[PDB]
Design an enzyme around this catalytic site. Structure first.
Site, PDB file in Angstrom:
ATOM      1  N   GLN A   1      36.832  45.827  39.342  1.00 31.50           N
ATOM      2  CA  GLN A   1      37.559  45.368  38.214  1.00 31.50           C
ATOM      3  C   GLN A   1      38.058  46.545  37.358  1.00 31.50           C
ATOM      4  OE1 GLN A   1      35.588  42.708  35.184  1.00 31.50           O
ATOM      5  NE2 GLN A   1      37.482  41.865  34.735  1.00 31.50           N
TER       6      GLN A   1
ATOM      7  N   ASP B   1      40.648  48.250  39.317  1.00 27.78           N
ATOM      8  CA  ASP B   1      41.724  47.303  39.137  1.00 27.78           C
ATOM      9  C   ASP B   1      42.523  47.527  37.843  1.00 27.78           C
ATOM     10  OD1 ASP B   1      42.784  44.420  38.092  1.00 27.78           O
ATOM     11  OD2 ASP B   1      42.691  44.515  40.279  1.00 27.78           O
TER      12      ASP B   1
ATOM     13  N   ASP C   1      42.807  50.090  35.996  1.00 31.28           N
ATOM     14  CA  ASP C   1      43.415  51.415  35.880  1.00 31.28           C
ATOM     15  C   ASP C   1      44.815  51.366  36.503  1.00 31.28           C
ATOM     16  OD1 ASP C   1      44.051  54.284  37.010  1.00 31.28           O
ATOM     17  OD2 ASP C   1      42.312  54.677  35.757  1.00 31.28           O
TER      18      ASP C   1
ATOM     19  N   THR D   1      49.791  52.541  34.378  1.00 29.50           N
ATOM     20  CA  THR D   1      50.296  53.493  35.368  1.00 29.50           C
ATOM     21  C   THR D   1      49.786  53.231  36.759  1.00 29.50           C
ATOM     22  OG1 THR D   1      48.535  55.180  35.020  1.00 29.50           O
ATOM     23  CG2 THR D   1      50.495  55.350  33.643  1.00 29.50           C
TER      24      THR D   1
ATOM     25  N   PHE E   1      49.113  55.064  38.900  1.00 29.70           N
ATOM     26  CA  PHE E   1      48.193  56.125  39.291  1.00 29.70           C
ATOM     27  C   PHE E   1      46.740  55.873  38.941  1.00 29.70           C
ATOM     28  CE2 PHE E   1      51.529  58.911  40.559  1.00 29.70           C
ATOM     29  CZ  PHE E   1      52.601  58.523  39.770  1.00 29.70           C
TER      30      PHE E   1
ATOM     31  N   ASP F   1      44.316  57.220  37.289  1.00 31.95           N
ATOM     32  CA  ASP F   1      44.304  58.320  36.327  1.00 31.95           C
ATOM     33  C   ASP F   1      43.515  58.081  35.033  1.00 31.95           C
ATOM     34  OD1 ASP F   1      45.605  56.479  34.923  1.00 31.95           O
ATOM     35  OD2 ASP F   1      47.590  57.355  35.128  1.00 31.95           O
TER      36      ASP F   1
ATOM     37  N   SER G   1      43.980  55.708  32.981  1.00 33.86           N
ATOM     38  CA  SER G   1      44.811  55.072  31.948  1.00 33.86           C
ATOM     39  C   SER G   1      43.987  54.005  31.224  1.00 33.86           C
ATOM     40  CB  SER G   1      46.025  54.436  32.581  1.00 33.86           C
ATOM     41  OG  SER G   1      45.590  53.713  33.696  1.00 33.86           O
TER      42      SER G   1
ATOM     43  N   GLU H   1      36.702  41.582  28.355  1.00 31.93           N
ATOM     44  CA  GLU H   1      36.745  40.274  29.073  1.00 31.93           C
ATOM     45  C   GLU H   1      35.298  39.790  29.128  1.00 31.93           C
ATOM     46  OE1 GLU H   1      36.236  39.773  33.007  1.00 31.93           O
ATOM     47  OE2 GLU H   1      36.211  37.567  32.763  1.00 31.93           O
TER      48      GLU H   1
ATOM     49  N   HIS I   1      37.294  38.351  42.585  1.00 32.84           N
ATOM     50  CA  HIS I   1      36.888  37.122  41.921  1.00 32.84           C
ATOM     51  C   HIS I   1      35.778  36.383  42.677  1.00 32.84           C
ATOM     52  CE1 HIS I   1      40.970  37.174  39.649  1.00 32.84           C
ATOM     53  NE2 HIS I   1      40.059  37.936  39.068  1.00 32.84           N
TER      54      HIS I   1
HETATM   55  C1  HEM Z   1      33.455  38.631  35.184  1.00 38.26           C
HETATM   56  C2  HEM Z   1      34.496  39.370  35.709  1.00 38.26           C
HETATM   57  C3  HEM Z   1      36.053  38.941  35.746  1.00 38.26           C
HETATM   58  C4  HEM Z   1      36.745  37.928  35.080  1.00 38.26           C
HETATM   59  C5  HEM Z   1      36.026  36.926  34.078  1.00 38.26           C
HETATM   60  C6  HEM Z   1      38.180  38.000  35.490  1.00 38.26           C
HETATM   61  C7  HEM Z   1      39.233  37.193  35.069  1.00 38.26           C
HETATM   62  C8  HEM Z   1      40.635  37.418  35.313  1.00 38.26           C
HETATM   63  C9  HEM Z   1      41.805  36.611  34.851  1.00 38.26           C
HETATM   64  C10 HEM Z   1      41.855  35.267  33.968  1.00 38.26           C
HETATM   65  C11 HEM Z   1      42.900  37.235  35.337  1.00 38.26           C
HETATM   66  C12 HEM Z   1      44.319  36.720  35.081  1.00 38.26           C
HETATM   67  C13 HEM Z   1      45.318  36.992  36.170  1.00 38.26           C
HETATM   68  C14 HEM Z   1      46.302  35.847  36.165  1.00 38.26           C
HETATM   69  O1  HEM Z   1      46.268  34.998  35.262  1.00 38.26           O
HETATM   70  O2  HEM Z   1      47.105  35.834  37.089  1.00 38.26           O
HETATM   71  C15 HEM Z   1      42.386  38.449  36.114  1.00 38.26           C
HETATM   72  C16 HEM Z   1      43.145  39.279  36.817  1.00 38.26           C
HETATM   73  C17 HEM Z   1      42.687  40.278  37.596  1.00 38.26           C
HETATM   74  N1  HEM Z   1      41.398  40.655  37.919  1.00 38.26           N
HETATM   75 FE1  HEM Z   1      39.930  39.249  37.419  1.00 38.26          FE
HETATM   76  N2  HEM Z   1      38.359  39.033  36.407  1.00 38.26           N
HETATM   77  C18 HEM Z   1      37.043  39.591  36.562  1.00 38.26           C
HETATM   78  C19 HEM Z   1      36.657  40.581  37.352  1.00 38.26           C
HETATM   79  C20 HEM Z   1      37.448  41.336  38.095  1.00 38.26           C
HETATM   80  C21 HEM Z   1      36.857  42.354  38.933  1.00 38.26           C
HETATM   81  C22 HEM Z   1      35.298  42.605  38.972  1.00 38.26           C
HETATM   82  C23 HEM Z   1      37.887  42.935  39.584  1.00 38.26           C
HETATM   83  C24 HEM Z   1      37.902  44.105  40.627  1.00 38.26           C
HETATM   84  C25 HEM Z   1      36.897  44.493  41.434  1.00 38.26           C
HETATM   85  C26 HEM Z   1      39.065  42.269  39.082  1.00 38.26           C
HETATM   86  C27 HEM Z   1      40.409  42.513  39.424  1.00 38.26           C
HETATM   87  C28 HEM Z   1      41.484  41.741  38.822  1.00 38.26           C
HETATM   88  C29 HEM Z   1      42.838  42.053  39.140  1.00 38.26           C
HETATM   89  C30 HEM Z   1      43.348  43.163  40.105  1.00 38.26           C
HETATM   90  C31 HEM Z   1      43.663  41.097  38.313  1.00 38.26           C
HETATM   91  C32 HEM Z   1      45.254  41.052  38.272  1.00 38.26           C
HETATM   92  C33 HEM Z   1      45.507  42.187  37.226  1.00 38.26           C
HETATM   93  C34 HEM Z   1      47.040  42.474  37.084  1.00 38.26           C
HETATM   94  O3  HEM Z   1      47.790  41.723  36.395  1.00 38.26           O
HETATM   95  O4  HEM Z   1      47.434  43.531  37.643  1.00 38.26           O
HETATM   96  N3  HEM Z   1      38.757  41.317  38.196  1.00 38.26           N
HETATM   97  N4  HEM Z   1      41.066  38.474  36.068  1.00 38.26           N
HETATM   98 CA   LIG Z   2      46.493  54.105  35.977  1.00 36.40          CA
END
Ligand code: HEM
Ligand SMILES: [Ca+2]
Ligand SMILES: *[C@H]1O[C@H](CO)[C@@H](O[C@@H]2O[C@H](CO)[C@@H](O[C@H]3O[C@H](CO)[C@@H](O)[C@H](O)[C@@H]3O)[C@H](O)[C@H]2NC(C)=O)[C@H](O)[C@H]1NC(C)=O
Ligand SMILES: *[C@H]1O[C@H](CO)[C@@H](O[C@@H]2O[C@H](CO)[C@@H](O[C@H]3O[C@H](CO)[C@@H](O)[C@H](O)[C@@H]3O)[C@H](O)[C@H]2NC(C)=O)[C@H](O)[C@H]1NC(C)=O
Ligand SMILES: *[C@@H]1O[C@H](CO)[C@@H](O[C@@H]2O[C@H](CO)[C@@H](O)[C@H](O)[C@H]2NC(C)=O)[C@H](O)[C@H]1NC(C)=O
Ligand SMILES: *[C@@H]1O[C@H](CO)[C@@H](O[C@@H]2O[C@H](CO)[C@@H](O)[C@H](O)[C@H]2NC(C)=O)[C@H](O)[C@H]1NC(C)=O
EC number: 1.11.1.7
Length: 595
Positions: free
Chosen positions: A105, A108, A110, A184, A186, A188, A190, A258, A351
């Site tokens: 996360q 993610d 970054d 970014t 990257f 990095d 951010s 979060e 997730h």
């Molecule tokens: C308890 C932990 C977490 C909760 C409650 C949570 C919740 C959310 C929610 C509501 C979104 C909204 C995206 C959308 O509406 O389309 C999101 C996006 C995202 N989360 Fe989860 N998340 C959690 C953990 C994680 C973890 C642990 C990772 C990576 C190992 C992660 C990676 C992402 C990514 C890559 C997005 C899309 C971000 C973007 O817009 O680039 N998340 N998360």
């Molecule tokens: Ca970055």
């Protein structure tokens, strides 16, 4: 085959040919074209966006527009019929710590954030959506099936406003719609420092000349620092307990608070930046603020690059790791920086890795306190459990000693996230991350699962029996098929997360391909990469791969008992060892003896 240059939502200001550290915004990493990887630019498209009207509408928008001759299923029906489960027994990952999920996360955040389209906050834009459940312009509400208990208890729908798209925000209309990445591309840091100028330095301690980030002044954690508080009301960390009135944290990335564990992870990161700035003034008494800031920032980013690529990726990617990320040959500058749109969906495999609870452990790794283990849904934007109930040592111990959830085709997402998610402005712990994930692949106009399989040079099913074979699962495939009628319509998200995990990895083929390719690219096309000859000095480099997330824990918390491998499954007395049998980051190779 077109579209040459829509580069409107950015101020043009051009480059610096040394500026020995990255720019906060990522611009100027690439010299031939400047923007490539810059925040607030458009996520890259590896494939033509697939929309209803070939332009902007999401499949599942108009009642009678079939996707390939079939109606697409509601995200929440896809959710209630495939993604959820009742029994949290036997769901943990015997070989991955809670920290495994945490880092994901973190990494993610970054690389990618696709912010919700604002388009008016002194409008009904809001009321017309949640309150009356009307679909329109950016209100793409998640409707309930029938048979869905939420009918009897929450209403006709859940909120879901579409994502920020470029060029304007105001309504487009003639070639494809592209969502933005507000951070970014990257790796990095951010997430610690910022991705906008504006926020870099609010995070900074300009008041003094040492080079650290602003630390909290209202509160302390032992002798250690706390991220600076956040300014804006309405503040959700204030909303869960109106009595405690503890606000959310302030960091380089906006989603920091979060849940308690990410905020926590975020706190280890700042302390390390300050820690790096004392040792430096110490050694280089003459270097000014900026210099201990960019050079700290500089080590911090490198650090995040090594844990992720040296410790995390081999355990997500597994066997698929060399096939896409063969080792480092240095900076190719034809390589693309830009996080791809589908990556933002592929990376949410995480997730399926969040368990239903979080614990606080004490010095012998046992229940710290009476109400130590808590339901995840009570930790969303909960900051108070930290400053007013124990600091982050307790939580870092749970990160170290509890386990992540394991994806299970029969237990995908835990209900703490699937029926009980809290969303910054919608008052109830009643949302669903699965449905939302699915509504969004459509919002981003994602190509189906078979387009992505084709793209990854993977076989593509067209029948139940075929879908069965690939998922190595019969009733999952039968359910998937009943909702979608053809695997062509399966949303990249659940589609990719239904595929069994590869050997020694934690994602399947489809995802290892999508994942692998992105990281290969953010590393190869990164001009400020730590191995990138010249970027670092050679001892400075031998110092670095001695860094570890175990050591990060010691320099910055009063936890004096750590596991050699932070991401692997670790139980206390045993896989723990004192912090002194541990590799430190020796900074004498950064010593400038300009005297
Ligand atoms: C308890 C932990 C977490 C909760 C409650 C949570 C919740 C959310 C929610 C509501 C979104 C909204 C995206 C959308 O509406 O389309 C999101 C996006 C995202 N989360 Fe989860 N998340 C959690 C953990 C994680 C973890 C642990 C990772 C990576 C190992 C992660 C990676 C992402 C990514 C890559 C997005 C899309 C971000 C973007 O817009 O680039 N998340 N998360
Ligand atoms: Ca970055
Ligand atoms: C929001 O945070 C509140 C304020 O911190 C919290 O109340 C505090 O937490 C519990 C309430 O059950 C009390 O904790 C215990 O303190 C010692 C040991 O921890 C015990 O001897 C006490 O009897 C008590 O059980 C705190 O005293 C309490 N503080 C205050 C001022 O109320 C609320 O529970 C939280 N509210 C919600 C809705 O989450
Ligand atoms: C399940 O999870 C463990 C990881 O948390 C896993 O360990 C990894 O397995 C590979 C292969 O057995 C080992 O490889 C590493 O060590 C060799 C030693 O010769 C080095 O040459 C390589 O650099 C390589 O990184 C590791 O021991 C381990 N990998 C790492 C980085 O830790 C175990 O198989 C399982 N764990 C348990 C408790 O059963
Ligand atoms: C910027 O750095 C200085 C130095 O730490 C901060 O001032 C210190 O504040 C702490 C207590 O709040 C005490 O050590 C001293 O009062 C000051 N120490 C020194 C060495 O000057 C200043 O407040 C920092 N600002 C922020 C937001 O972190
Ligand atoms: C730099 O990256 C580019 C773009 O990813 C790579 O382009 C390849 O080069 C081949 C050479 O024949 C071209 O035909 C193709 O467009 C690409 N094919 C493959 C298999 O990559 C290029 O390989 C990279 N250059 C360096 C020095 O790494």
């Amino acid at each position: 085959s077109w579209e040459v240059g829509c580069g409107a939502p950015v101020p043009l200001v051009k480059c610096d040919e040394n500026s020995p550290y990255r720019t906060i915004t990522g611009d100027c990493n690439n010299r031939r074209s400047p923007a490539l990887g810059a925040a607030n630019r458009a996520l890259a498209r590896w494939l033509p966006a697939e929309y209803e009207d070939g332009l902007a509408l999401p499949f599942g928008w108009t009642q009678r527009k079939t996707r390939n001759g079939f109606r697409v299923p509601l995200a929440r029906e896809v959710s209630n019929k495939i993604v959820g489960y009742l029994d949290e027994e036997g769901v943990l990952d015997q070989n991955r710590s809670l920290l495994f999920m945490q880092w994901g996360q973190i990494v993610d955040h970054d690389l990618d954030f696709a912010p919700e389209t604002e388009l008016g906050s002194n409008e009904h834009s809001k009321t017309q959506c949640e309150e009356y459940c009307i679909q329109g312009d950016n209100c793409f509400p998640i409707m309930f099936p029938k048979n869905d208990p939420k009918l009897k208890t929450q209403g006709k729908c859940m909120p879901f406003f579409r994502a920020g798209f470029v060029c304007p925000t105001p309504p487009y209309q003639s070639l494809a719609r592209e969502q933005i990445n507000a951070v970014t591309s990257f790796l990095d840091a951010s997430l610690v420092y910022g991705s906008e100028p504006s926020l870099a330095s609010r995070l900074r301690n300009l008041s003094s000349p040492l080079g650290l980030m602003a630390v909290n002044q209202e509160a302390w954690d032992h002798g250690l620092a706390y991220l600076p508080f956040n300014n804006k009301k309405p503040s959700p960390c204030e909303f869960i307990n109106t009595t405690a009135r503890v606000p959310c944290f302030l960091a380089g990335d906006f989603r920091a608070s979060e849940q308690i564990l990410l905020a926590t992870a975020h706190t280890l990161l700042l302390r390390e930046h300050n820690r790096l700035a004392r040792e430096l003034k110490k050694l280089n008494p003459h270097w000014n603020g900026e210099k201990l800031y960019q050079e700290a920032r500089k080590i911090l980013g490198a650090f995040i690059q090594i844990i992720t690529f040296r410790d995390y990726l081999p355990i997500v990617l597994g066997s698929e790791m060399q096939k896409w990320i063969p080792p480092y040959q240095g900076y190719n500058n034809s390589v693309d920086p830009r996080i791809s749109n589908v990556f933002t969906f592929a990376f949410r495999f995480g997730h399926m890795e969040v368990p239903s609870t979080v614990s606080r452990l004490d010095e012998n790794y046992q229940p710290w306190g009476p109400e130590a283990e808590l339901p995840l849904h009570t930790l969303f934007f909960n900051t108070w459990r930290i400053i007013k109930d124990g600091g982050i040592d307790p939580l870092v111990r749970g990160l170290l000693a509890k386990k992540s959830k394991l994806m299970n085709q029969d237990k995908m997402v835990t209900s703490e996230l699937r029926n009980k998610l809290f969303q910054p402005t919608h008052k109830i712990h009643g949302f669903d991350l699965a449905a939302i994930n699915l509504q969004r692949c459509r919002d981003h106009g994602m190509p189906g699962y078979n387009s992505w399989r084709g793209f990854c040079g993977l076989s593509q099913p067209k029948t139940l029996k075929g879908l069965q074979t690939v998922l190595k699962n019969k009733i999952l495939a039968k359910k998937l098929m009943d909702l979608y009628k053809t695997p062509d319509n399966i949303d990249i998200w659940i589609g990719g997360n239904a595929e069994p995990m590869v050997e020694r990895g934690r994602v399947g083929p489809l995802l290892a391909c999508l994942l692998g390719r992105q990281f290969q690219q953010i590393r190869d096309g990164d001009r400020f990469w730590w191995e990138n000859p010249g970027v670092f000095t050679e001892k400075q480099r031998d110092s670095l791969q001695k860094v570890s997330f175990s050591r990060l824990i010691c320099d910055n918390t009063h936890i004096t008992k750590v596991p050699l491998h932070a991401f692997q499954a670790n139980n206390y007395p045993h896989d723990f060892v004192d912090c002194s049998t541990v590799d430190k980051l020796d900074l004498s190779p950064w010593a400038s003896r300009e005297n």
